[PDB]
Amino acid sequence: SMLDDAKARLRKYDIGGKYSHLPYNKYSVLLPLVAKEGKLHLLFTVRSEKLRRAPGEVCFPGGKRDPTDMDDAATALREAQEEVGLRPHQVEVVCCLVPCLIDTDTLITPFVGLIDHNFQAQPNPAEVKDVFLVPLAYFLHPQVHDQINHIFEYTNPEDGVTYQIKGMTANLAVLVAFIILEKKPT
Ligand SMILES: O=C(Cc1ccc(F)cc1)Nc1cccc(Cl)c1
């Protein structure tokens, strides 16, 4: 099946807890895969304009590890619940992808999660201005604009709204698309 095939692909790239004890400032993100209309999608947030770090940017759900978290995956799930109302029974964490090093002292660990079909986002407006889906296949043929660094523009056909996706978030989206969609019979 589509979902069993996606999980099987993802597991081959799982690094697990290999880098998880290193003494960094630690953040996790959840890359949430949603199946709709017979295709996989990624769920993104738009950060609230009131946040002082990166207001109005497109990001995956996530945030800083805290002492309650059993592990890095727990960080991702706790933050996703706070930001968009995703409950732990509504997500299956499939793997941990390559972590992202930033600012010399920070390590961001991305987890891919399969999201239940009955989940409906409840954006928390203190943190999230918007939540939206992008089909995973978009990231194989994105609409690129150069600002010099590459920016993806995705227009939602439901409503005509264009979102800019860039940086780590864009990079991770492409990675997941490659992992899941490469070398597939039609
Ligand atoms: O904060 C994140 C994930 C993230 C962590 C570290 C990082 F460097 C880059 C993204 N995500 C988020 C998305 C919406 C609202 C809020 Cl409050 C947080």
Taking alpha carbons only, the member of 124, 104, 110, 92 closest to residue 25 is 104
Cβ–ligand 1 contact at 27 (below 6 Å) = yes
Element (H, E) at 103: none
Take residue 180 and report the two structure tokens written for it: 């899941």
Task: Please name the residue ranges forming H helices in 62-166.
Answer: 72-84
Q: Could you tell me which residues come within 8 angstroms of residue 183 by beta carbon, excluding any fewer than 6 positions away?
A: none
**Distance, CA 141 to ligand 1 centroid (Å)?**
25
For ligand 1, mutation pick of 29, 53, 64, 122 (most atoms within 8 Å of CB): 29
Cβ of 45 less than 6 Å from ligand 1 = yes
Q: What is the resolution of this structure in A?
A: 1.6
> What single-letter DSSP state applies at residue 183?
S
Two tokens at 116?
Answer: 């239940």
Approach to solving: X-ray
- Quickly tell me which residue has 């999660």 as its tokens: 113
Nearest CA to ligand 1 atom 14: 47
How far is Cα 179 from Cα 5, in angstroms, rounded to an integer? 11
Q: Report the atom number in ligand 1 closest to the C-alpha of 29.
A: 3
